[PDB]
Design a protein around this ligand. Structure first.
Ligand SMILES: Cc1ccc(COc2cccc(CNc3nnn[nH]3)c2)cc1
Ligand SMILES: Cc1ccc(COc2cccc(CNc3nnn[nH]3)c2)cc1
Lengths: 254, 257
């Protein structure tokens, strides 16, 4: 059994590597010791677009948001491709695959955004840029407080010092949550999650021997993830209520 | 590599099933009396059309408006599916919009063929079936909307594609680097090259005794273009004649420019 959990851990890490171009290791390397272009106020953002070839650019506050929606839609596709490698996922009922992705992408998006944040800012644009936390906060209400709860989560989450090999298994666990509303067949889902939890537990024990109950502590963060998503939806229900193009709004439904 | 193209074919098929609730497989089981599905109520005339409400302006306007609601829903589905085509969401955003703007019709009339035979067309997710002759008896010019779509469907349906074939083909259609106004033609053409390569292998494996089916399928892109032009010129007549009637905003933003 233990050899099997090592094998599963290795398979997931390989898939994560093929699926996510900017890994946590690569991001920490950029945030520590080339280097990214920095956006810290209104002036460095005008320059930042000249320089960085933004794929999302057709007012300041909404334009940064739309780019966050752009990259998030890109992230969905990366997570979806990763999910397919999780053993048993593709044998699940199709509707349930869709249901698991739909309710899980937001949680995985904020998990992986933390790999790319520190207390001072967040990498953007595949790490070519770095946008400070102060400039984000300084955005007019209600735009200057959607990334702030993200940062505060990332601070605490990053203090657990997970690497990519850890996150690969953790992300699979989130996807295989048997309590998403509207699932048809919870068995194989909760069955696969049991195997993944067993592998994450062994991974954390071998990779962080001195970090007692890191397994438990990481589980406790899934609580914080659910809380942030529900609070994010509440802001999304207002950016779709305060700020008011048909084809574009169709691409960025949800 | 063939193994990689097979994986692309599987990906698109799997995403196609997730995006389009009413497949060709389900439509044919409804139209050919199979017992996996149910028989449609058939609308011929004012009398059945009126019984169709109690089972599923004026007549011709009401059919047109409902057909417009359906086009909007299809545009929503085709949008979801496009985001699944690898590389699509990584393209410049203005081009994504452009690829959907010119793409959705060619795809709509492709998938509308799945819902047709020579005698009429499934409606309301297959619960209903409206005849080709009733659609032509509609007053001018609403009676001319549907007939060219029937003529294409009859020829297109003789290729005998199933949903796995269609999924790659509609992907090829979205990723056309000759759409007007595109900014970065090259990355769009790089993706279509893989899509075309995947469709080629898919057609050879799924239809091994169907020679030049790949060529024959690319050739229908000609018939698709003509349907769109005709359809647009027909919508311009109603815009000048029924100044009380409104096009849905998603639809009007597609036809603009
Ligand atoms: C792994 C991952 C998942 C989701 C997201 C999506 O979340 C964000 C938030 C802030 C900036 C960016 C980068 N792109 C951008 N946004 N604004 N300008 N460039 C993305 C990023 C990574
Ligand atoms: C409930 C209902 C469903 C379908 C129809 C009509 O059948 C369809 C079905 C799908 C696409 C199109 C597009 N064809 C078109 N667009 N504008 N004019 N013709 C026509 C009428 C009522």
């Amino acid at each position: 059994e233990s050899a099997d959990l090592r094998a599963l851990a290795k398979h997931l890490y390989d898939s994560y590597i093929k699926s996510f171009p900017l890994t946590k290791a690569k991001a920490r390397a950029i945030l520590t010791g080339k280097s990214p272009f920095v956006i810290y106020d209104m002036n460095s953002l005008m320059m930042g677009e000249d320089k960085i070839k933004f794929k999302h650019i057709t007012e300041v506050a909404i334009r940064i948001f739309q780019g966050c929606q752009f990259r998030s839609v890109e992230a969905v596709q990366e997570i979806t491709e990763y999910a397919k490698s999780i053993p048993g996922f593709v044998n699940l009922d199709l509707n349930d695959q869709v249901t698991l992705l739909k309710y899980g992408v937001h949680e995985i998006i904020y998990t992986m955004l933390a790999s790319l944040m520190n207390k001072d800012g967040v990498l953007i644009s595949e790490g070519q840029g770095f946008m400070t936390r102060e400039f984000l906060k300084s955005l007019r209400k209600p735009f200057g407080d959607f990334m702030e709860p993200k940062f505060e989560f990332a601070v605490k989450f990053n203090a657990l010092e997970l690497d990519d090999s850890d996150l690969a298994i953790f992300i699979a666990v989130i996807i295989l949550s048997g309590d998403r509303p509207g699932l048809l067949n919870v068995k194989p889902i909760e069955d696969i999650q049991d195997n993944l939890l067993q592998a994450l537990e062994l991974q954390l024990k071998l990779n962080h021997p001195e970090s007692s109950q890191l397994f438990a502590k990481l589980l406790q963060k899934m609580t914080d993830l659910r809380q942030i998503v529900t609070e994010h939806v509440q802001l999304l229900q207002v950016i779709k209520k305060t700020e008011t193009h048909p084809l574009l709004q169709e691409i960025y439904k949800d």
